[PDB]
């Protein structure tokens, strides 16, 4: 019979065509909705359509079934593609045949395996061509994750090194991150992740069938990052007691987290955080083919049970009583994927927000799920998934009540805190920051904003607030350099033409990005502050390194809160600010000419800003397109104040194009300090 000796998958051509060149190392990895090539090597009889009939059968999942789309059998139609799964002969030479297979744009995602059934006469021999991986295609016009443009496809599906935005609203810091979705073994890790969710354990066949929908895959991926408690990827922790594992700030790449999760069976990786969850989810989604970007919202009202009215009761000193209340997060990071939604009303296609951080649900504290960004913009809270929570995270209202010792309460005019004021992501192509707050909220004070609030029953906050002549804000003169003492001003501007005798309550506390305040690092209690008519007074507060050294969080955030209170019945004024203390810059240099499969040396240096010595200095670099594993060096000698630490590392780049070298510094006193540098690998 027509027996075959070997089947030659064209790894190079398929990888180049389907943009899966990095993934096509040893196994074929193609994208649905596109024709991929294949080669058959028959020894002597070659192939004749007259008597030889080939019918491919492709199998997926532990419970295949034709009606569910997992299993598909299709003949060798030489003329055209008459259906979803088709195979046509494109070239026929001596001893060899070529094939151009095609997959439906709505095929399930996962590990498929082929089977040739060569039926010549009565001899229907059954073969096994091999396995391959099917991923979401952003290039197929009929696919649900199709992107019209090309730069967006490169940035969101093929770029494996990006920026996570942190710090404060007034000072955005672009911390580098190495997604590495195309790293060695990452795709298998993502498949195992998709093969261990509770839905798969409940009904494997239904899960495999429903993997075709990108929204379901997004839900499964986001829910298995942290939300799953049994064998989730990470284990959240917020108190600064990460000694049992790796601190959240220490992570520089999701590849390490995924490899640690896979190696230790499936146990939770130690002490991740919200932006870590977003980075891991973005890595998994990008590996699976879904165009995903990490989006950070500053002053987010996360974990408020979707409440649109947040009331904070404070004391006469401005300190928030009632510890049961949840603080306003300085920033919250969630992913945003590109999908088309048939399950919703027409027009709700495009960017969909996934939040892998479990909020406080009324049932079980689950994740959020894909809500259209346009749905949040128009306030369509009635969508399928958790629209109200994401809407509250960007459109909440905060009321700061002051409860004095007399038992009475007053409303403080807090004009500084705006929920969801700055939403940022990485720009397409360049390294700049793209401020996408306009796609989540309508412009303030506009008719569209009013109608969106009316559709969301949220028009309560639109009402005008107090308009007293007193005005006040927290001002910063120079850059916030960590490890040095500084002064932060409280600016009072008066235009009422009325002399005021008020008392001011400066207080600075080390705070994490969750809003968990720590011990005070400086205070100032002015009791007879005088404000002249049409005057403008700046009251400085001195913050000392010896004060915030002990309790500073690893995110280098300090909250300065000041309260201007008049003894008379008139209301109270409040002003808060978040200061990001800048870590010292990591100077990265590359010596030699960057060439593929050639030795490279990276000269990394840092200058210690602290007045004391760092003991356990440790550099760690990672790059998806530069190295196959993290390069870690430990300096065995402490570096004194002002002294400069300097190390050299060896790299063996293996991929072309542009790459980012993510560098992390970890010492006993200077915490995780990040750095990056773009390198272009030469053709050689
Ligand atoms: N590192 C750091 N720099 C800051 C921060 N806030 C402000 N700055 C610096 O202050 C400058 C802007 O000053 P600005 O805040 O507008 O002054 P203000 O309007 O009087 O409060 C920028 O160049 C920043 O470098 C912060 O939290 N961290």
Residue numbers in the entry: 4 to 687
Q: What does the primary publication say about this deposited structure?
A:
Transglutaminase 2 (TG2) is a GTP-binding, protein-crosslinking enzyme that has been investigated as a therapeutic target for Celiac disease, neurological disorders, and aggressive cancers. TG2 has been suggested to adopt two conformational states that regulate its functions: a GTP-bound, closed conformation, and a calcium-bound, crosslinking-active open conformation. Using SAXS and cryo-EM, we show that guanine nucleotides bind and stabilize a monomeric closed conformation while calcium binds to an open state that can form higher order oligomers.
X-ray crystallography structures of TG2 have revealed that GDP or GTP binds to a “closed” conformational state that occludes the protein-crosslinking (transamidation) active site and thus eliminates its crosslinking activity. Previous crystallographic studies of TG2 bound to GDP have shown that TG2 has a propensity to crystallize as a closed state dimer. To confirm that the structure of TG2 bound to guanine nucleotide is in fact a closed state monomer, we used cryo-EM to solve a 3.2 Å structure of TG2 bound to GDP. As described in crystallographic studies, GDP is stabilized through π-π stacking interactions of the guanine ring with Phe174 as well as several hydrogen bond interactions between the α and β phosphate of GDP and a trio of arginine residues, Arg476, Arg478, and Arg580. Importantly, due to the stabilizing interactions with Arg580 in wildtype TG2, GTP is able to bind to the closed state TG2 monomer by achieving a high-affinity interaction that can overcome the flexibility of the β-barrel domains. The SAXS experiments were carried out at 25 µM TG2 to achieve a sufficient scattering signal, while the cryo-EM analysis was carried out using 3 µM TG2 as was necessary to obtain an appropriate particle density, which made it possible to capture the monomeric form of the TG2 open state.
